[PDB]
Amino acid sequence: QSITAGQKVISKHKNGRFYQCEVVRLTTETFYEVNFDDGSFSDNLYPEDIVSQDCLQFGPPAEGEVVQVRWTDGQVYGAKFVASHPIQMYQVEFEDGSQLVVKRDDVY
Numbered sequence: 001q002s003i004t005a006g007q008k009v010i011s012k013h014k015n016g017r018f019y020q021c022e023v024v025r026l027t028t029e030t031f032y033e034v035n036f037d038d039g040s041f042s043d044n045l046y047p048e049d050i051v052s053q054d055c056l057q058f059g060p061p062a063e064g065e066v067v068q069v070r071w072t073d074g075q076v077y078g079a080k081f082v083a084s085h086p087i088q089m090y091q092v093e094f095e096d097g098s099q100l101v102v103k104r105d106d107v108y
């Protein structure tokens, strides 16, 4: 079912619980897909996780470009850029004033 900006919905707060909130904007968020040097892949990188360049300012690396990626452990690993994945998402606001960007699957 279609979710629009201004709609009151239920979504996941930064504390991990579901609360009533308001959709404050529809937003396209870009995730990056890379191939690590061990042959493994990840398609959930933020553009800021590429530490060898400024992707927010200059855009994605070229397909096949060797990059340095800061992973979830704070460690930097070498990888090769594969693809950009722009996804329609929802920016929600809770009554404490906090805001998060959530996926369609986290909105009720």
Ligand SMILES: CN(C)C[C@H]1[C@H]2CC[C@](c3ccccc3)(C2)[C@H]1O
Residues within 6 Å of the ligand: 036, 037, 038, 040, 041, 042, 071, 077, 078
């Ligand atoms: C998506 N993967 C399952 C996880 C990643 C990150 C944790 C190890 C890593 C990696 C990168 C480079 C060499 C060895 C190992 C980075 C890879 O396996």
